[PDB]
Amino acid sequence: TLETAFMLPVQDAQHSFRRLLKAMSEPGVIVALHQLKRGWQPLNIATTSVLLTLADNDTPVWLSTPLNNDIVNQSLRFHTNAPLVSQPEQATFAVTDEAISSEQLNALSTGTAVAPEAGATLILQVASLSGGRMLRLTGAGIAEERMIAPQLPECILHELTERPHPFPLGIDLILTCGERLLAIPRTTHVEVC
Amino acid sequence: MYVAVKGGEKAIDAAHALQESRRRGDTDLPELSVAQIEQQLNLAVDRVMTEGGIADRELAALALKQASGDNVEAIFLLRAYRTTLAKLAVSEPLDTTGMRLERRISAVYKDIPGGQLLGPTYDYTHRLLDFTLLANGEAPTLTTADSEQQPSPHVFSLLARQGLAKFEEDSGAQPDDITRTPPVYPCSRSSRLQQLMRGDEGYLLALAYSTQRGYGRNHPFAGEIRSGYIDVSIVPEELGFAVNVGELLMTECEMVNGFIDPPDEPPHFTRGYGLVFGMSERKAMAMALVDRALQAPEYGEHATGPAQDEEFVLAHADNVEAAGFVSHLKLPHYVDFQAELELLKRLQQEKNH
Amino acid sequence: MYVAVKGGEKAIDAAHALQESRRRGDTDLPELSVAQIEQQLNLAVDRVMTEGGIADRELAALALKQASGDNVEAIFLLRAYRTTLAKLAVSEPLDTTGMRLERRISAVYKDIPGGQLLGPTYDYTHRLLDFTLLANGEAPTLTTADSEQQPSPHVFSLLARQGLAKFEEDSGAQPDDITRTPPVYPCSRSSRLQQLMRGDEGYLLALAYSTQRGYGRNHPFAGEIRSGYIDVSIVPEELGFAVNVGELLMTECEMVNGFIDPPDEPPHFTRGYGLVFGMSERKAMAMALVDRALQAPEYGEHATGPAQDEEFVLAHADNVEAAGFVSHLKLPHYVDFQAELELLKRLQQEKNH
Amino acid sequence: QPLLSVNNLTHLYAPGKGFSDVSFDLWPGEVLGIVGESGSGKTTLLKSISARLTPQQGEIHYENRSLYAMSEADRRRLLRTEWGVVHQHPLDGLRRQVSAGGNIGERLMATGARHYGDIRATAQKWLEEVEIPANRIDDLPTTFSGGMQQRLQIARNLVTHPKLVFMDQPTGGLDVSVQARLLDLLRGLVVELNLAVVIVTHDLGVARLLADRLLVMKQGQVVESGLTDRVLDDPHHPYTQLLVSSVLQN
Amino acid sequence: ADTATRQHWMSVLAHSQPAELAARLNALNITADYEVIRAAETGLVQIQARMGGTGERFFAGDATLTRAAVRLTDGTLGYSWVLGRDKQHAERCALIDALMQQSRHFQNLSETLIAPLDADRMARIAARQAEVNASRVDFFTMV
Amino acid sequence: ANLSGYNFAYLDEQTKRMIRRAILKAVAIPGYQVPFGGREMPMPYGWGTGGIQLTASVIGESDVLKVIDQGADDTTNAVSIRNFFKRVTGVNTTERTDDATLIQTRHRIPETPLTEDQIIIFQVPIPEPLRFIEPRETETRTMHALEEYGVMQVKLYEDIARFGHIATTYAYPVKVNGRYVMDPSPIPKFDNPKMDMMPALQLFGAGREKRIYAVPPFTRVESLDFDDHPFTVQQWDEPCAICGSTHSYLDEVVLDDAGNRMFVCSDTDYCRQQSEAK
Amino acid sequence: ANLSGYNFAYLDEQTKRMIRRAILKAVAIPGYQVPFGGREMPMPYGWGTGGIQLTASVIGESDVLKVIDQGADDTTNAVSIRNFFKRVTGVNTTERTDDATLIQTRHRIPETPLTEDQIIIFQVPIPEPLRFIEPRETETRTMHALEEYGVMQVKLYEDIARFGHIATTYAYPVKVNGRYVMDPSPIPKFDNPKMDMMPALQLFGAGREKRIYAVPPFTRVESLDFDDHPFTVQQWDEPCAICGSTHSYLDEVVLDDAGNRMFVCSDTDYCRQQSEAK
Numbered sequence A: 001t002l003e004t005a006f007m008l009p010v011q012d013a014q015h016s017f018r019r020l021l022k023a024m025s026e027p028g029v030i031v032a033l034h035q036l037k038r039g040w041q042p043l044n045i046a047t048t049s050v051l052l053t054l055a056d057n058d059t060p061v062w063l064s065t066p067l068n069n070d071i072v073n074q075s076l077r078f079h080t081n082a083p084l085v086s087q088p089e090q091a092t093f094a095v096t097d098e099a100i101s102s103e104q105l106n107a108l109s110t111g112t113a114v115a116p117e118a119g120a121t122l123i124l125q126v127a128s129l130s131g132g133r134m135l136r137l138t139g140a141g142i143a144e145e146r147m148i149a150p151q152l153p154e155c156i157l158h159e160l161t162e163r164p165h166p167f168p169l170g171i172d173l174i175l176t177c178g179e180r181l182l183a184i185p186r187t188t189h190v191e192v193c
Numbered sequence B, C: 001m002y003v004a005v006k007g008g009e010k011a012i013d014a015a016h017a018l019q020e021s022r023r024r025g026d027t028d029l030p031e032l033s034v035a036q037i038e039q040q041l042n043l044a045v046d047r048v049m050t051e052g053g054i055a056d057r058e059l060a061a062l063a064l065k066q067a068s069g070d071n072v073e074a075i076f077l078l079r080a081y082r083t084t085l086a087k088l089a090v091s092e093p094l095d096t097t098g099m100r101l102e103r104r105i106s107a108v109y110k111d112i113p114g115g116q117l118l119g120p121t122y123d124y125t126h127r128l129l130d131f132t133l134l135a136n137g138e139a140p141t142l143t144t145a146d147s148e149q150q151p152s153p154h155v156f157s158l159l160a161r162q163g164l165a166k167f168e169e170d171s172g173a174q175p176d177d178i179t180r181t182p183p184v185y186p187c188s189r190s191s192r193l194q195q196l197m198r199g200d201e202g203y204l205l206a207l208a209y210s211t212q213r214g215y216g217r218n219h220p221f222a223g224e225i226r227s228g229y230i231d232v233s234i235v236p237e238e239l240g241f242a243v244n245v246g247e248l249l250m251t252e253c254e255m256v257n258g259f260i261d262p263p264d265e266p267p268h269f270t271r272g273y274g275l276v277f278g279m280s281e282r283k284a285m286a287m288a289l290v291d292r293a294l295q296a297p298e299y300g301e302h303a304t305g306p307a308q309d310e311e312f313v314l315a316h317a318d319n320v321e322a323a324g325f326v327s328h329l330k331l332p333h334y335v336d337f338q339a340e341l342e343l344l345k346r347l348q349q350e351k352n353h
Numbered sequence D: 001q002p003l004l005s006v007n008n009l010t011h012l013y014a015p016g017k018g019f020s021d022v023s024f025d026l027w028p029g030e031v032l033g034i035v036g037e038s039g040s041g042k043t044t045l046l047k048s049i050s051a052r053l054t055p056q057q058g059e060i061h062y063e064n065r066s067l068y069a070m071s072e073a074d075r076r077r078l079l080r081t082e083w084g085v086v087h088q089h090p091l092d093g094l095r096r097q098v099s100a101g102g103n104i105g106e107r108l109m110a111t112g113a114r115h116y117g118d119i120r121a122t123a124q125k126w127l128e129e130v131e132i133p134a135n136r137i138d139d140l141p142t143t144f145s146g147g148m149q150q151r152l153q154i155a156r157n158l159v160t161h162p163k164l165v166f167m168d169q170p171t172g173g174l175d176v177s178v179q180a181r182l183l184d185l186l187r188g189l190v191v192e193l194n195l196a197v198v199i200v201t202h203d204l205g206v207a208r209l210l211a212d213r214l215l216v217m218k219q220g221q222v223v224e225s226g227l228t229d230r231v232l233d234d235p236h237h238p239y240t241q242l243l244v245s246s247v248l249q250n
Numbered sequence E: 001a002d003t004a005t006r007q008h009w010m011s012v013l014a015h016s017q018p019a020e021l022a023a024r025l026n027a028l029n030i031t032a033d034y035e036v037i038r039a040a041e042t043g044l045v046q047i048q049a050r051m052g053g054t055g056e057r058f059f060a061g062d063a064t065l066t067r068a069a070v071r072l073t074d075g076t077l078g079y080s081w082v083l084g085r086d087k088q089h090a091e092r093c094a095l096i097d098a099l100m101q102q103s104r105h106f107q108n109l110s111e112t113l114i115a116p117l118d119a120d121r122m123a124r125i126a127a128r129q130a131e132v133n134a135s136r137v138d139f140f141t142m143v
Numbered sequence F, G: 001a002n003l004s005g006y007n008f009a010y011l012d013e014q015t016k017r018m019i020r021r022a023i024l025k026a027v028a029i030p031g032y033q034v035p036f037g038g039r040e041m042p043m044p045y046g047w048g049t050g051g052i053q054l055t056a057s058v059i060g061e062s063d064v065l066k067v068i069d070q071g072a073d074d075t076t077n078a079v080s081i082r083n084f085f086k087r088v089t090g091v092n093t094t095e096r097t098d099d100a101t102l103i104q105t106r107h108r109i110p111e112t113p114l115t116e117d118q119i120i121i122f123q124v125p126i127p128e129p130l131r132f133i134e135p136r137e138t139e140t141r142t143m144h145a146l147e148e149y150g151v152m153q154v155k156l157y158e159d160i161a162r163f164g165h166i167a168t169t170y171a172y173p174v175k176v177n178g179r180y181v182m183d184p185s186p187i188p189k190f191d192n193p194k195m196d197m198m199p200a201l202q203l204f205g206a207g208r209e210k211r212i213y214a215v216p217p218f219t220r221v222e223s224l225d226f227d228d229h230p231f232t233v234q235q236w237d238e239p240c241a242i243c244g245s246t247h248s249y250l251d252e253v254v255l256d257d258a259g260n261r262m263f264v265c266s267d268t269d270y271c272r273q274q275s276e277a278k
C-alpha cells in the first residue's frame, strides 16, 4: 500500500540534490528532477524527490491539510523516517499548496540572527512555474536579473517583494510544479513587473 | 630550463613502504600479534578505546599495532573506523551499582562497606626497572580469598543519606550528542562529560593538576574509584524487551569537592564524575576534576584558572583535532609563505629607504 | 568490639601480583619481548625516551613492557631509573647540520636544496584499520634510489642569508639545568626548552593548537623538520680530545613565526625550536610552537592565551609531577576529610537553628 | 516630538538599589542634566536609557520606536552610529590595546568612512578640539592620563556627530581650562547641530552652564525636576536644598 | 515466564565465550534447517551512562555490537545482539534462541546447553573474585 | 566504478543528507558559517576533511574531479585525496580546470576562469575571519549575528598605522553580498578578485571547526580595504621561468645553498597551457 | 644491613649533601621554604617523595624509623615506604613513637609527645601556605620576602564573615618565630598545637614542589586566628570505640550501608597504648 521511493536512492538523491543546488544557487532557474517517475499524490514529483533527498529523522516535516494524506504520511515515515508535526512552527521543511495562508507563512520558523540556518524551508506546490505575474529577480545567483512568471499566492508574493524579515533571517522557497523545481532563497530581491 | 615532473605518488608510496617496514622491524624477531598487545599492553588499549570512542579491545590493539605504538595515531584510527560503522542501538543507562568489582577504593574513609579493594594496580609499587623482564619469566601464582563480592554501596550514597552531599538526580533531559551536532558553548554538563571522555589524557591531567595547585581550586577528595565489569543492555524494536548484550570493563571515579553554602539549603559537598573504558584511572580522575572545574557557571564561581574556561578547555581537549591541526603544518604552505615573504620584503625595502 | 588487624602489606602484595598477572595476560600467548616493543612500537618508545629523559630505546621498551603499555607509568619508570645513574660526561653541543637524514621536509618552499625527503611517515596515509595485521604478513620489499645524501642546508640558514630571519647566535651562556636546580620563574629560554622536551605531549599539543586558534597566535610555518641520526661526542678528561661515542636518532623542528618590526633593524621572522628523541614529530612541533609562545617577554607581546603564561605552562607540563599528584588522591585522605566533615556538620547545625 | 521618551522606567538590583518610576522627555538641541547623591541610581538610569540595561518596567521610545522591543542588532546599530556613550571611567569606553587614533576612527569607519587619511585627519582634529596634542594619536590610552583618557573617550563618542549622547560625569578628571573648552564644545554641538545630551554630573556649575533642564535623583526616585536655574536657585524638595547648600563657593 | 526465560537464555548466550559455545553446539549435533533473516551485521551500540551513576544521562562512547536474525522452518524467529565483532557467534546465538523458542528443544537445551554455560561463567567469576578478594585491605575484626 | 567495499563517496547517506542541507542553507545565507555534524575522515583533521566531506556529498558518477593543493595537482595531499576519491567513487579525474566539474582546492583558485555548472570546493582550516582577532566562538557568533565588524576595521587601521600596510596577505577577509564578513580560505590576496561575480558556485568546508559556508554564483565579494590603501595583489619582478607568464601566482623554488632561486607558476595546469601555447 | 645493590638510603652522596645543606639553611631560617634539587624517587610525586628524600639524607644505621600515614603504621603507603627504607638501609623499625628516632609522617603528628633528639619528617604536597590564595610562585616568593601576609588575613576575615568560621580545617597556616607564615603539611588543626615549642626537630619536605623547610626545637608556632575566634581543634561527641580515649584525633569507620559507624583513634600506636593500659 505504501508508495515507492527512488529506484536508486544514492544516485537519485545525489542527482536531485545537484539539481536543487543549481536552482538555489541560481534563483529563478528551473530544474527538472526526472529520477522519480511518480510522486506521492497529492505531492508532485519534485516535492517528493526533495523530501526523499533531504528529509530524515532530524528534519520535522509539516504538511498542509490539502497535502496531508495518510498514504503520503506513511510513505514519508517508512522511507525517510522524518517526524511529522501538525504545526508549521515546528517544521524544518514545510509543504503547502496555493491555499497557504498568511498566518501559516508567518508561523514558519525564520531562524535567529546567531543561527539563521535554524529556520524552515518552504516547499510550495504551484499551479505552474510560468503563467503568473512577471517577476524580476536580482541578487546572489543572478548576474543581472532573471525574469520568472510563477503563479504564486499573494502572501508568497508579499513575502518575496517586501521581505518582512531582516537578513540573515528568512525562509527559502522551493516552487514545485510536476517534475520541475524553482528556488528563491531569502537573499533574492524580487520586483513585480 | 626546468620541466615539471611527477614525484608525489611514488614518493608517497615509498614513504608508506618505509613506515610499514619500520613498523615490522627486524624480520628475525617474530611479528607482534594483536592479542599480545591487547593482553600485555592493556592500559594503552584502555586509553585508545576511551579516546577513540569504541570499547573494543581488539580494535584498539589493532590500531596500536598499525600505529607503531603511537597512541595519537591509534586513537585517530579508531575514531575514523567509528565513522564507518552504523549505530545499531542505544544502550540503556549504565548501572554502576551492578558492577562486578575488580578494584574499589575510597580515600575519604579508612574503611567502608565492602572494604578497600585494591585489585590490580601499580599503586604503591617501587618504580624500579625490572630487568628480569628482558627475558621470559613465570607469572606469579595468585593467592585466593573467599569469592563473595561483599556489598559495595557508592560512597556518595552514604554521604547523601547523611545530608553531606546531594544525590545526582535524573530529570529525564535528553543528553546532548556532540558526535552528531557540533558543540555550542556554553555546553551542557552532558556534552562536557562526553567531550572530556574523548579528551586528551595528558591535557586534562595538566588542567586538573593546575586546579590542584590553586588555578581554580575545587578541594578534591577521591570519594570512590570503582573498576570492573558492567553489563550492557539494549531494547531492540524487534522484541520490545531488554536484552543483555555483554559486559564492558569500565572505571568510574567520584570526587568530593569543596562544600558550598546555598542560600536556601544546608551547606553540602559538590561533586565531580569521571568514566572511562578499562582499568586506567588517572583519565577518569582528571575527567571528574575538570568536570567540577567547568561546573563553575552552575555555582557562580569566579574563575581563577584556565581549567574553568569552558571554550578553551573543550575546544582543545580532543587530541584528534589538535594533533591533526598541529601536524598539518607539515603540509606544503609555500603559497601562503610566499605571500608573507612578498609583504615582508616590501616592508624591509620601505624601511631601508 | 573491634580490634585492629594487619592488612596493608598482604593486600599490597596481592594487588601487585594481580597487576603482574594481568600484564602477562593469557599464558597461551607468548610473552612480549622488549626487542619486539622496541622495533614494532618504536613511536611509543620515542615518546617514552623523550619524556623520561633517557635516549635508550631498550630501556624505554622495557619500561613500556613493565607499565603494561601505560606511557605515563613507563615515562616515570625511566625518569626514576635516570635518578639511579651517574653522570659520566656532558656531550659536546649537537651539530644537527651533520645529521644523517631519514626524513627532511619543509612547508615554506615547494622545493629546497636537498629536496623534500618524506622518509618513513604515516602522513598522507588513509587511516583505515588494516585488519590484515590481525594475522602475520610479509613486509614490503623496499624500492631503492641512489644512495648519496644530497646537501641539506637548514632552511633557516637560507632565510637568514636573505635577511628575512635572524641567525640563532651563541653568546657562550651556560645553559640552566632544571634537573639539578629547581626552576625559577621567569625561566631562561634554555630552561624553558629543557622543560618542554620533558613536557607532556598531549598538554603541549593542546597549547599549540590553542595558539593556532588565536589564543596567543604566532603565525607558524613548518620551516623545516629533520629526522635522522646525529653523532654524539664527548671530551673525557682521561684523553683531553673529542671522542665519538655513537649516534642518536633525533627529530628537529624549526618553525617560522610571525615577523616583527624592531625599532633599529629590518623586520624579520621570529622562530621556534623543537628537539626530541626518535621519529615522533608532533612533540617537536608543539615544543617549537610553545617555545615561540613563551618567548613573549623577549618581544614585549601582550599575552592573549594561557600558552603564553610561563608559570602555568611549565609548572604543569611535566606529566610525572601532574600524574603523580592527580593519582595521589587515591591515597587515604580520611584525616583531612574528617576535619572537613567536622566543619561541615557544625555549619549545617548552625544554619539549621 | 521628543527625540527620547522614558515612561515609568524602573530597574532595581534590590529594594532601594537602582531607579524606579522614572519618566522624562528629551528633545533635539537641549541638555538634560542629572544630579543627585552618590548612590541614587543615576548611572543605572543612564545605562537603561542607553540600551545597556534592560528595565524591569516602563518603556523607552527613540524616534517613536520602543528601544528594547527592537532587535539587538538595531540597538547595537544605534550605539554604533548615532548614539554616544561616555562612561565615568574612560578606559571602560576605550580600547586599551588600540591607539587613540584607532579609538576615534572605529566610530568613523562604523559610519561608512573608508579613507585612512581622512579618518586620521578627523582624529587629529578632534584631539586638538579637546586640546590633546596631535602627536599622541598613535599612543595607547594606557599611556594617557585620566583627563586625557576622558577627553579621548569624549572625542570618540562625538566624532560621528551623534544625535544623542549619554555622559556620566564627563568633566571628572579634567582641569578647569579643558573643562571650559569641553563645555563650549558641547554647547556649540547642541545649538548648531541640534545635539541632545543626557549628562550625569556632580559639579552643579557645569550643570548650570550647560544643562537646559535638570533631574534631581535620590534613593532611586526623581525627587525634583524642571528648569535648571529654577531648580538650583528655587529648590523645593529638601534634598535639592541640601544639595545646593553644599556647593563650595569660589 | 516466557519473556524472563528468553531474556535469561539470550544473556547466557551473549556472555558465553564463542569457542565453548561452538564446541558445545557441535557436540550436541542439533539438526535444524534455518534461513538467515538478517545476515550478521557488526555496528555500534551507543553507551549511555549517568552522572554520578544515578543522575542525568550522557553518552559515554560506543561499543562494537553484532546482531543476527535467523528463521526456523516453522517460522520461529531467533535473534542475537552480542558485544564484539564475532559474526558466527551471533548467528549461533540467534539459532539457539530460535531453538529455545521451540517446545521440543527448550528443556533439552536448558538442561544441556544453557545451564552448563551459566555454570561455567559463574565458576570463572567465582574464581576471579577469589583472586581479586586477596587484595582487600583488612582494618578491623569484630571479636 | 566503486569497488572499495565502502559506500559511494565513503560517507553514509545520513551524513551526505545533513551536509547537503547545510550546503543549501549556506547558499541561502552567503558568507555565513553553517554548523554541521562533520565526521572524522581517513585524513586527519586539518588536512582537508571538510572539503573531502563536501565533495563526497556533492560528487556524482558523471563528475570530473580535479584536486589541487597549492595550485598543483601532483601535490602530496592532493594526490592522496584524488586517490581516495577514485577508490571510493571511481570518478573520472583531470588536471585541466576547464574540463573539471568539481574542483577541490587548498589555498589557490585556478588562473583559468571558472564556468557555469562548475563547483570549486575550498579546504578551510579557520572558517572565522575574526578568529585571530577574537579567539572565542561565543563572541564571534554574536559579532556576525549583529554585524559587529568594527574590530576588523580597527585591526586594519592599526596595521596601516603600524606597518603602513595591511598585514594580512592570505585568507584576506572579504564582504559577501554586502553583509557577511567571510574568510576566503588561505588563498592569497591574488585569488580574492576571482571570487567576485564568479559564474561557478563556491563551497567552503572546515571539517575540524565543523563549518560550511558558500558563495553562490554571481555574488559580490569585495575585499576589505580603504580608498587610499586599495586592495593590491602579490607581485613579482620575475616571470615564470618555465612558461614566462606574468599574470600568475608564483611559487619560489630554491635551487642551491649559494642563493640561486627561480619562480614558477603555482597553477601547474595554467603553466602547462601557457608553455604549450608558446 | 643494606643488601639491595643500591647506595645506602638509595640516594647518591651528592643529593644527600645538597639536601643536608638545604636542611641546615631551613633550620637557620625557620618557616622559610628552601628550594632544593629534588630527584625523582621510586614513589610517584605527591606520594611522599620529599619526606623520603629527607629521611634518606638524615637516616643512619643506628636510627629507629617509624613510618605512619594518617597516623597508622599499617597504612599502604606507610608500609611501602617502610619496606623501601628497610631494603635500602636495613634500619630498625618500630611502631612506637617513644622508641623511634626518626618519624616520617603524612597528615598526623603522634599523640605521644616527642622528645629530644627525635626528628619528625612531614610529607608536604603544597609547601606554600598562600598557594590556594595566590597560585603563582612568582608572587608568593615576593610576599614571603616582604612579609606581605595581608592576603591571608583578608582570607580569614572573609571566611569568618561568610561562614562564621575559618574554612581551613587542615594544613592550617601557622606563624613561625613570629616571622614566616608556614604550611604545617595537611595535618589537622588538632595537631597544630603540638608544633609549638616542640622538643623534637621538625622537617618538612615537598619533593614535587622542590621545597624543604624546618622548625627547630623549642620554636614558637602560633596558628593564625582572632581573639574572638580562637583556634579550636576538631572535636567528637564519641570516644574511641576501641580504647575509649577522648583526647585523640578520631577517624570515622563506616560499618554498613544502613548507617552504622564508629570512631577510632587515627594514631594506632596511641590506641594500642591506651587499650593496654586499660
Ligand SMILES: Nc1ncnc2c1ncn2[C@@H]1O[C@H](COP(=O)(O)OP(=O)(O)NP(=O)(O)O)[C@@H](O)[C@H]1O
Pocket (backbone or CB within 6 Å): D013, D014, D016, D017, D018, D036, D037, D038, D039, D040, D041, D042, D043, D044, D045
Ligand atoms: N551591580 C550591582 N549589583 C547590586 N547593586 C548595585 C549594583 N550597581 C549598583 N548597585 C547599587 O545601585 C545603586 C545605584 O547605583 P548607581 O546608579 O551606579 O549610583 P550613582 O547615583 O550613579 N552613584 P555616583 O556614581 O557616585 O554618582 C547604588 O546603591 C549602588 O550601590
Ligand SMILES: [Mg+2]
Pocket (backbone or CB within 6 Å): D042, D043, D044, D088, D168
Ligand atoms: Mg554613577
Ligand SMILES: [Zn+2]
Pocket (backbone or CB within 6 Å): B328, B329, B333, F125
Ligand atoms: Zn596552515
Ligand SMILES: [Zn+2]
Pocket (backbone or CB within 6 Å): C328, C329, C333, G125
Ligand atoms: Zn591530598
Ligand SMILES: [Zn+2]
Pocket (backbone or CB within 6 Å): F240, F241, F242, F243, F244, F245, F248, F264, F265, F270, F271, F274
Ligand atoms: Zn608558468
Ligand SMILES: [Zn+2]
Pocket (backbone or CB within 6 Å): G240, G241, G242, G243, G244, G245, G248, G264, G265, G270, G271, G274
Ligand atoms: Zn583508641
